[PDB]
Amino acid sequence: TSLYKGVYELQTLELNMETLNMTMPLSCTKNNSHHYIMVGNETGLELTLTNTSIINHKFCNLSDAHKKNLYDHALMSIISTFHLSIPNFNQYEAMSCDFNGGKISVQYNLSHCGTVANGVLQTFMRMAWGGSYIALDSGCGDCIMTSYQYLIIQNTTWEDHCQFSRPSPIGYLGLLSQRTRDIYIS
Amino acid sequence: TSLYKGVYELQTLELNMETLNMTMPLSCTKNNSHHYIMVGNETGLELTLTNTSIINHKFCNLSDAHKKNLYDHALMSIISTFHLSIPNFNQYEAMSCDFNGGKISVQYNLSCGTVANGVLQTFMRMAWGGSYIALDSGCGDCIMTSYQYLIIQNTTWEDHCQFSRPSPIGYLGLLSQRTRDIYIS
Amino acid sequence: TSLYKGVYELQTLELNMETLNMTMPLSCTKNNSHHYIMVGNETGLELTLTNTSIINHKFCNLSDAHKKNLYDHALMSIISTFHLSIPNFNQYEAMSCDFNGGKISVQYNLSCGTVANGVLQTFMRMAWGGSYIALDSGCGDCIMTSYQYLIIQNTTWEDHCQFSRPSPIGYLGLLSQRTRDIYIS
Amino acid sequence: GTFTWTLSDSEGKDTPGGYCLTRWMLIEAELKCFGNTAVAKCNEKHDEEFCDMLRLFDFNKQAIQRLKAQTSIQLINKAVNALINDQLIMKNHLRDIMCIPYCNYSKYWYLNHTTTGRTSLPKCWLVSNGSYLNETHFSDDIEQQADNMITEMLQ
Amino acid sequence: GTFTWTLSDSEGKDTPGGYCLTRWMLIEAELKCFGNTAVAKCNEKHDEEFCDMLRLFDFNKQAIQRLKAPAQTSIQLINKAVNALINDQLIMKNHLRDIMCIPYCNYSKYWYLNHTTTGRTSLPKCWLVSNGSYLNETHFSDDIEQQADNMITEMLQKE
Amino acid sequence: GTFTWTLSDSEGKDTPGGYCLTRWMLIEAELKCFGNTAVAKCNEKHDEEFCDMLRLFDFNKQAIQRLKAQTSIQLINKAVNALINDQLIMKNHLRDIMCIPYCNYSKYWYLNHTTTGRTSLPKCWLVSNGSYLNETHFSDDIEQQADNMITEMLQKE
Ligand SMILES: *[C@@H]1O[C@H](CO)[C@@H](O[C@@H]2O[C@H](CO)[C@@H](O[C@@H]3O[C@H](CO)[C@@H](O)[C@H](O[C@H]4O[C@H](CO)[C@@H](O)[C@H](O)[C@@H]4O)[C@@H]3O)[C@H](O)[C@H]2NC(C)=O)[C@H](O)[C@H]1NC(C)=O
Ligand SMILES: *[C@@H]1O[C@H](CO)[C@@H](O[C@@H]2O[C@H](CO)[C@@H](O[C@@H]3O[C@H](CO)[C@@H](O)[C@H](O[C@H]4O[C@H](CO)[C@@H](O)[C@H](O)[C@@H]4O)[C@@H]3O)[C@H](O)[C@H]2NC(C)=O)[C@H](O)[C@H]1NC(C)=O
Ligand SMILES: *[C@@H]1O[C@H](CO)[C@@H](O[C@@H]2O[C@H](CO)[C@@H](O[C@@H]3O[C@H](CO)[C@@H](O)[C@H](O[C@H]4O[C@H](CO)[C@@H](O)[C@H](O)[C@@H]4O)[C@@H]3O)[C@H](O)[C@H]2NC(C)=O)[C@H](O)[C@H]1NC(C)=O
Ligand SMILES: *[C@@H]1O[C@H](CO)[C@@H](O[C@@H]2O[C@H](CO)[C@@H](O[C@@H]3O[C@H](CO)[C@@H](O)[C@H](O)[C@@H]3O)[C@H](O)[C@H]2NC(C)=O)[C@H](O)[C@H]1NC(C)=O
Ligand SMILES: *[C@@H]1O[C@H](CO)[C@@H](O[C@@H]2O[C@H](CO)[C@@H](O[C@@H]3O[C@H](CO)[C@@H](O)[C@H](O)[C@@H]3O)[C@H](O)[C@H]2NC(C)=O)[C@H](O)[C@H]1NC(C)=O
Ligand SMILES: *[C@@H]1O[C@H](CO)[C@@H](O[C@@H]2O[C@H](CO)[C@@H](O[C@@H]3O[C@H](CO)[C@@H](O)[C@H](O)[C@@H]3O)[C@H](O)[C@H]2NC(C)=O)[C@H](O)[C@H]1NC(C)=O
Ligand SMILES: *[C@@H]1O[C@H](CO)[C@@H](O[C@@H]2O[C@H](CO)[C@@H](O)[C@H](O)[C@H]2NC(C)=O)[C@H](O)[C@H]1NC(C)=O
Ligand SMILES: *[C@@H]1O[C@H](CO)[C@@H](O[C@@H]2O[C@H](CO)[C@@H](O)[C@H](O)[C@H]2NC(C)=O)[C@H](O)[C@H]1NC(C)=O
Ligand SMILES: *[C@@H]1O[C@H](CO)[C@@H](O[C@@H]2O[C@H](CO)[C@@H](O)[C@H](O)[C@H]2NC(C)=O)[C@H](O)[C@H]1NC(C)=O
Ligand SMILES: *[C@@H]1O[C@H](CO)[C@@H](O[C@@H]2O[C@H](CO)[C@@H](O)[C@H](O)[C@H]2NC(C)=O)[C@H](O)[C@H]1NC(C)=O
Ligand SMILES: *[C@@H]1O[C@H](CO)[C@@H](O[C@@H]2O[C@H](CO)[C@@H](O)[C@H](O)[C@H]2NC(C)=O)[C@H](O)[C@H]1NC(C)=O
Ligand SMILES: *[C@@H]1O[C@H](CO)[C@@H](O[C@@H]2O[C@H](CO)[C@@H](O)[C@H](O)[C@H]2NC(C)=O)[C@H](O)[C@H]1NC(C)=O
Ligand SMILES: *[C@@H]1O[C@H](CO)[C@@H](O[C@@H]2O[C@H](CO)[C@@H](O)[C@H](O)[C@H]2NC(C)=O)[C@H](O)[C@H]1NC(C)=O
Ligand SMILES: *[C@@H]1O[C@H](CO)[C@@H](O[C@@H]2O[C@H](CO)[C@@H](O)[C@H](O)[C@H]2NC(C)=O)[C@H](O)[C@H]1NC(C)=O
Ligand SMILES: *[C@@H]1O[C@H](CO)[C@@H](O[C@@H]2O[C@H](CO)[C@@H](O)[C@H](O)[C@H]2NC(C)=O)[C@H](O)[C@H]1NC(C)=O
Ligand SMILES: *[C@@H]1O[C@H](CO)[C@@H](O[C@@H]2O[C@H](CO)[C@@H](O)[C@H](O)[C@H]2NC(C)=O)[C@H](O)[C@H]1NC(C)=O
Ligand SMILES: *[C@@H]1O[C@H](CO)[C@@H](O)[C@H](O)[C@H]1NC(C)=O
Ligand SMILES: *[C@@H]1O[C@H](CO)[C@@H](O)[C@H](O)[C@H]1NC(C)=O
Ligand SMILES: *[C@@H]1O[C@H](CO)[C@@H](O)[C@H](O)[C@H]1NC(C)=O
Ligand SMILES: *[C@@H]1O[C@H](CO)[C@@H](O)[C@H](O)[C@H]1NC(C)=O
Ligand SMILES: *[C@@H]1O[C@H](CO)[C@@H](O)[C@H](O)[C@H]1NC(C)=O
Ligand SMILES: *[C@@H]1O[C@H](CO)[C@@H](O)[C@H](O)[C@H]1NC(C)=O
Numbered sequence A: 001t002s003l004y005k006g007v008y009e010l011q012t013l014e015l016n017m018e019t020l021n022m023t024m025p026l027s028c029t030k031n032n033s034h035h036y037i038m039v040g041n042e043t044g045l046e047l048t049l050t051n052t053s054i055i056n057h058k059f060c061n062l063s064d065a066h067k068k069n070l071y072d073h074a075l076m077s078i079i080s081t082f083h084l085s086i087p088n089f090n091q092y093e094a095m096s097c098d099f100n101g102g103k104i105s106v107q108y109n110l111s112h113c114g115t116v117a118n119g120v121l122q123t124f125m126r127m128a129w130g131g132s133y134i135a136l137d138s139g140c141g142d143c144i145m146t147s148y149q150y151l152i153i154q155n156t157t158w159e160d161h162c163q164f165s166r167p168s169p170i171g172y173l174g175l176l177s178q179r180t181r182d183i184y185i186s
Numbered sequence B, C: 001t002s003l004y005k006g007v008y009e010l011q012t013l014e015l016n017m018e019t020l021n022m023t024m025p026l027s028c029t030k031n032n033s034h035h036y037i038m039v040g041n042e043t044g045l046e047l048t049l050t051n052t053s054i055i056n057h058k059f060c061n062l063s064d065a066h067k068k069n070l071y072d073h074a075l076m077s078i079i080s081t082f083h084l085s086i087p088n089f090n091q092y093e094a095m096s097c098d099f100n101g102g103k104i105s106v107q108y109n110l111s112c113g114t115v116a117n118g119v120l121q122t123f124m125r126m127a128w129g130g131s132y133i134a135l136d137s138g139c140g141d142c143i144m145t146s147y148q149y150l151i152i153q154n155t156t157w158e159d160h161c162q163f164s165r166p167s168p169i170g171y172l173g174l175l176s177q178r179t180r181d182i183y184i185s
Numbered sequence D: 001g002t003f004t005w006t007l008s009d010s011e012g013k014d015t016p017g018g019y020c021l022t023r024w025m026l027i028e029a030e031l032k033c034f035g036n037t038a039v040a041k042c043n044e045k046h047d048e049e050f051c052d053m054l055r056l057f058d059f060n061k062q063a064i065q066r067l068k069a070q071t072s073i074q075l076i077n078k079a080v081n082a083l084i085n086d087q088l089i090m091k092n093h094l095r096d097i098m099c100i101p102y103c104n105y106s107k108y109w110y111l112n113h114t115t116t117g118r119t120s121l122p123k124c125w126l127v128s129n130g131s132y133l134n135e136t137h138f139s140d141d142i143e144q145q146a147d148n149m150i151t152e153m154l155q
Numbered sequence E: 001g002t003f004t005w006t007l008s009d010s011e012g013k014d015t016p017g018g019y020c021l022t023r024w025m026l027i028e029a030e031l032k033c034f035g036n037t038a039v040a041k042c043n044e045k046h047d048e049e050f051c052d053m054l055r056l057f058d059f060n061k062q063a064i065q066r067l068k069a070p071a072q073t074s075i076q077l078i079n080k081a082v083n084a085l086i087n088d089q090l091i092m093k094n095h096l097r098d099i100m101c102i103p104y105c106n107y108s109k110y111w112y113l114n115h116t117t118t119g120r121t122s123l124p125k126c127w128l129v130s131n132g133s134y135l136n137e138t139h140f141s142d143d144i145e146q147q148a149d150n151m152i153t154e155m156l157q158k159e
Numbered sequence F: 001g002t003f004t005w006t007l008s009d010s011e012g013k014d015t016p017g018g019y020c021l022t023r024w025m026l027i028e029a030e031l032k033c034f035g036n037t038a039v040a041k042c043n044e045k046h047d048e049e050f051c052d053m054l055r056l057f058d059f060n061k062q063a064i065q066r067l068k069a070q071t072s073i074q075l076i077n078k079a080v081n082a083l084i085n086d087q088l089i090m091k092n093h094l095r096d097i098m099c100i101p102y103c104n105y106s107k108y109w110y111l112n113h114t115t116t117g118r119t120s121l122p123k124c125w126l127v128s129n130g131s132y133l134n135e136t137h138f139s140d141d142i143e144q145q146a147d148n149m150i151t152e153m154l155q156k157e
Helices: A062-067 A073-085 A116-127 A170-177 B062-067 B073-084 B115-126 B169-176 C062-067 C073-085 C115-126 C169-176 D049-066 D073-083 D086-097 D139-154 E049-066 E076-085 E088-099 E137-156 F049-066 F073-079 F086-097 F139-156
Strands: A008-014 A026-029 A034-039 A043-050 A095-097 A105-109 A150-157 B008-014 B026-029 B034-038 B043-050 B095-097 B105-109 B149-156 C008-014 C026-029 C034-039 C043-050 C095-097 C105-109 C149-156 D019-021 D032-034 D107-113 E019-021 E032-034 E109-115 F019-021 F032-034 F107-113
Touching: A008 D139, A026 A170, A034 A073, A034 A116, A043 A073, A073 A116, A073 A150, A073 A170, A073 D073, A116 A150, A116 A170, A170 D073, A170 D086, B008 F139, B026 B169, B034 B115, B043 B073, B073 B149, B073 B169, B073 F073, B115 B149, B115 B169, B169 F086, C008 E137, C026 C169, C034 C073, C034 C115, C043 C073, C073 C115, C073 C149, C073 C169, C115 C149, C115 C169, C169 E076, C169 E088, D019 D049, D049 D073, D049 D086, D073 F086, D086 E076, D107 D139, E019 E049, E049 E076, E049 E088, E088 F073, E109 E137, F019 F049, F049 F073, F049 F086, F107 F139
Parallel strands: none
Antiparallel strands: A008 D107, A026 A034, A034 A043, A043 A150, A095 A105, A105 A150, B008 F107, B026 B034, B034 B043, B043 B149, B095 B105, B105 B149, C008 E109, C026 C034, C034 C043, C043 C149, C095 C105, C105 C149, D019 D032, E019 E032, F019 F032
């Protein structure tokens, strides 16, 4: 098809990351609003950007949730890596959660350059590595802005969601190093 | 003895890690129940697996212990490294401690995914030599042991390393995977 | 002007780190007492060793300061990297702060193994160039200084780097050893 | 540190070293095998993205064959730095931030000799704004790989 | 991991690979250029301090050119990229040497060999310093001697 | 990053860089010396376990000779990564978990010439369920080392 030096033919291959589902999580995006992280063939996590909120109380009962060991430990591990990877997070009010009955659900209020919405969107940009630019509108520029007001993270069941981008573990594996690399004093 | 290509003789070499005692800790094991981590030539640390408990109160007065700066800072460093290295530690009720007078003593009440697994995985790493003899788990993440408590106490140095030689490889590996798996508080 | 092997002449070069001011912080020192960290061409930090204190209350209202998002986010990220890089920090009474109106100012009350050693070890690393002048230490886990307080304050940029050239190597080194040595809370 | 995981050899191979990707590891493609001379570069270099993927695929293969658990996330969290170069994907993250064509780890390209059947180590097919680059935009990269193929074929 | 940042080539250079430091990157000096044969070692070795500085200077150059300048100097970018540019354990090595009274590298001055007629230069090694004063040539003479021999071996490897 | 510590050498030695382990560093053995050509691989390779031990033993020696203090754990907590490959010991932990013969960093094997005395770099003697492997179970590893020894002795001439 395309020959170089008359003897070397240019050939390609595309990896199907879906087969890594049993060992590592996989990030992907459905459309502009919805993005997903898949753990195995059953459980998962849905990162959705919406102008509509889902939690109105500004409390996060993590200690209660830990004691009542109902939630999936895997999903809790990736929801911790996300919140820790946020840089310069200083407005705990925007962080509101609801872990009643193991159902994990976390909401980040982006309405509250340098603001708390940048750091949460920077970490979201890394997390869903494929197809995150579609929701960002940012381009190249540090400072990230979006029309949407809330980033809602909910537990969900596995389906054929990865429509815009293929699944990949590259996003999650990168946040692991930059986990507690940027946090203020408590 | 046995020569390869007629000119190269196969020879051996066994290192004595005990000489590294002044710079880095050294883990080893005595029998199935008793394991040790040595720092220097006097102060040490014993971590044991017993069906008999040593602490019945379920509190860990860590802030009080820090303020009364009596304990050995080295032994506190390796016990912070241990507790931090536990992945998915979510039931604080099992950890009970007693640091009265500097004497450090920590008890983990054991009982796939339970808190006993994360503590035994970190114990498997800590005493790298001869941890398998107590795990009874083989190869298979999920570790199950018959013992009910893992008790960590300070101790004095003796010729304890009877089943496995002392080595620092155990402690050195937990230093990187220190705070790598910890939930939000 | 010194030839090796008759053809190879020995030549040198000295890097001007001041041009990296827009990308990374830069540590340097003015005299024995005063040291600085420079972030850009306008803001910065002042590390001072003085027998004279600046804060008398023993509280550090960090949560209030976070909520009132006035301070420079870059400056506090250096304050966090510094405080986290302190090994075996067990007496919170020495750290006293004042972040009223975004003006960040942190004071470490100094007085082997004490809290002063860990704060001076981190200070020795932070201002990599010309930290030995204030230490009086020489070579030896034990640093002792005559000064009683380490005060970090926000300041404006001036031609401060007189004794040592500015460099980012100090800051870049603490980033890896950030939370590597911290006790259980 | 750096990656220490060595790729495991299958039993029906002619030379110890090569690695093969099954038809279920590749999307819309049959199985492809790569020779020892190419995969040997995975142990030397630190910068190759396709090597990082082979170590991930191999680790997933070895972990399924030898263990039983899907909370297996604890295992990869320990092993990540022994399989991949963390800074290599940070490099791609930096390139994406700077409007530079980056590697999203999906498509790769390689040169395949017409009669020898020998292949280069697959390099990553870069992408910029949701579309892979044309052959015309990295043709001098392919030219350089073809030159390395000839000098290797002579040895 | 280890550093993956590759040094960017300017448009007018004759051979692809060399790197140049402007007169504003060097103090009390004009611009200095280093050949591809020297800079190539920066991709192989993990222990060279002058290489870690080149990646810092290049990253700073690339970030200013390609990224719209921040309002008030955001530090988040370098905190992400540090391990992809420098060897952290290399500067920890110099921190160990300073602690042990050994001459260490404070990343300011470097020395290299320049052939008087061909113009090729070795990779600049770090000029060590002990107690606020750089070492005399007399105290690392045998380090320079070894570099000349490697220069000879590298020059003969071309012919 | 990766280890940057270079193995210092003692004052009274024939060749610079050649390392020796004293009789107190070995168990039930006298002192053994390894030539420069062997230990030079410690700076190139990231994979060798015996090299990470030499950097530990040398660092121990250097810290004792040059400093005074036991709480010196703070020093090894800083310099661990400049000495040993963290992911190399994680490798053997993965092998142990997967029932693969792993390296417990105690015993090492190497080839030694009958007349030359030049030796290979000691590779780790693997162990599976509390017992070291027989020579018969890694025989093809020693064969490959002997071929590398021949190709290295030829480059001398
Ligand atoms: C790396 O970048 C490339 C390019 O930006 C990116 O490639 C894109 O991947 C998606 C996902 O596979 C492709 O979308 C497909 O498009 C075809 C035809 O357009 C559809 O038929 C596909 O739909 C099937 O799959 C859906 C989800 O499984 C099902 O719901 C549906 O019913 C169909 O069965 C699918 O939508 C897209 O075409 C490419 N783009 C290009 C230019 O090739 C890749 O995803 C990136 N990699 C990573 C890891 O992010
Ligand atoms: C690495 O170690 C070396 C050696 O210890 C160290 O070099 C020293 O750097 C300082 C700072 O640049 C030098 O001090 C200069 O001295 C000259 C005269 O010798 C003065 O003219 C300079 O003063 C000018 O600078 C002021 C502040 O910028 C200006 O306001 C004004 O224009 C002054 O004229 C300056 O003080 C010192 O001489 C060297 N020492 C040696 C031995 O060369 C270097 O800083 C270290 N690197 C790092 C990164 O720490
Ligand atoms: C790596 O794996 C190997 C093999 O599994 C392992 O080697 C074992 O080390 C132990 C401890 O050194 C050996 O046990 C010895 O056995 C002899 C008799 O066989 C005894 O005489 C020894 O007792 C002396 O030492 C005791 C403790 O100091 C004293 O209390 C006592 O009075 C004696 O003086 C000792 O128990 C064991 O034989 C070997 N196994 C083999 C197969 O060689 C090694 O420990 C592992 N390395 C690490 C770092 O874990
Ligand atoms: C998650 O990953 C697993 C494993 O990586 C995927 O399962 C794998 O699916 C393939 C294709 O269905 C299986 O191949 C099959 O092999 C048998 C013979 O063994 C053959 O008869 C079939 O025709 C097919 O080729 C493979 O065995 C299987 N592996 C395992 C361990 O189950 C799974 O599909 C992935 N799931 C998701 C939701 O991504
Ligand atoms: C902890 O480690 C230290 C140092 O690694 C061990 O001390 C060392 O012990 C050896 C053997 O006793 C000493 O060697 C001796 O050297 C003198 C000459 O100075 C010689 O006359 C003797 O015959 C012997 O060869 C070595 O000097 C000594 N080093 C130090 C710094 O004390 C110690 O034994 C270890 N302790 C434990 C409990 O493992
Ligand atoms: C560690 O945790 C275990 C389990 O969480 C604790 O065991 C529990 O201890 C209580 C109090 O001793 C037991 O209650 C008693 O049960 C008997 C019947 O077995 C009953 O007749 C008594 O009236 C009393 O209620 C409980 O059974 C026991 N549960 C199990 C599963 O063993 C243990 O006490 C904890 N240890 C420490 C030191 O905290
Ligand atoms: C992206 O896809 C999701 C799922 O297909 C869409 O979410 C649905 O939106 C409708 C209308 O608001 C709701 O009635 C459904 O309940 C939603 N489904 C889920 C699973 O939440 C979403 O509208 C799509 N967005 C875009 C921009 O295409
Ligand atoms: C988190 O815990 C707090 C305290 O247990 C809960 O707040 C209480 O909620 C009940 C029911 O609405 C009220 O009657 C109490 O007055 C509340 N107490 C306080 C101090 O606010 C809260 O509902 C919990 N939140 C979640 C999501 O579980
Ligand atoms: C979510 O709400 C925001 C804010 O109301 C919307 O952004 C506004 O869009 C209008 C129309 O383009 C502009 O006139 C406003 O200036 C925007 N406000 C801001 C703060 O940017 C956004 O379009 C909404 N998104 C969706 C999907 O409905
Ligand atoms: C392992 O060794 C320890 C110490 O030698 C044994 O613990 C002793 O057990 C006896 C009998 O109960 C007690 O009287 C001693 O006080 C114990 N010593 C210590 C230091 O605790 C232990 O029994 C041994 N276990 C096995 C399985 O061999
Ligand atoms: C410690 O206690 C546990 C639990 O009582 C013992 O494990 C039991 O052993 C018996 C006899 O083999 C079994 O019938 C039980 O099913 C076991 N229970 C469990 C929960 O595993 C264990 O043997 C005791 N260990 C020691 C050293 O006394
Ligand atoms: C901060 O760094 C910038 C850029 O590295 C320096 O600005 C450069 O100054 C030189 C000499 O005047 C000019 O030729 C360049 O064009 C400038 N570059 C830019 C991007 O402006 C600046 O001098 C440094 N500031 C301080 C205080 O060190
Ligand atoms: C180091 O330099 C600083 C700044 O030049 C000196 O601090 C000044 O000291 C005088 C006398 O006490 C005060 O009037 C000034 O207000 C101080 N300036 C600042 C910015 O604090 C300091 O005395 C010098 N120390 C040494 C040892 O030379
Ligand atoms: C700061 O105060 C300390 C303590 O008051 C001073 O150190 C004392 O210096 C005197 C005179 O050399 C000695 O006699 C004391 O023994 C020292 N005390 C201690 C605890 O070291 C120090 O010199 C003062 N520094 C300045 C700059 O005023
Ligand atoms: C290189 O190209 C050759 C030929 O184009 C490939 O060999 C073919 O492999 C397919 C499937 O494995 C077979 O159906 C064909 O019969 C083979 N053709 C020949 C001529 O042998 C080879 O797989 C390619 N190599 C790679 C790595 O893709
Ligand atoms: C390789 O073999 C030689 C000879 O078998 C060893 O050299 C001997 O070492 C012992 C103890 O150090 C001396 O007493 C002998 O005099 C030496 N013999 C000769 C001929 O030199 C050498 O030690 C071996 N190499 C290693 C690393 O053990
Ligand atoms: C989010 O914050 C905005 C502004 O602070 C506020 O108006 C809104 O009510 C908040 N929403 C929630 C759900 O807290
Ligand atoms: C989340 O998990 C809970 C408990 O397992 C379940 O009841 C709920 O339906 C899940 N949410 C979704 C969207 O599947
Ligand atoms: C533990 O330390 C305390 C205080 O140093 C000491 O009194 C006690 O004896 C130690 N415990 C043992 C078992 O040696
Ligand atoms: C610092 O500590 C010393 C001794 O504990 C005390 O005398 C002094 O008042 C303290 N200073 C401040 C500002 O707290
Ligand atoms: C510190 O910052 C505050 C607020 O920006 C400012 O008012 C004050 O002058 C600064 N301090 C110095 C010494 O510049
Ligand atoms: C080497 O010397 C020549 C002639 O003196 C000079 O032009 C060149 O710039 C020098 N090289 C460097 C790197 O300074």
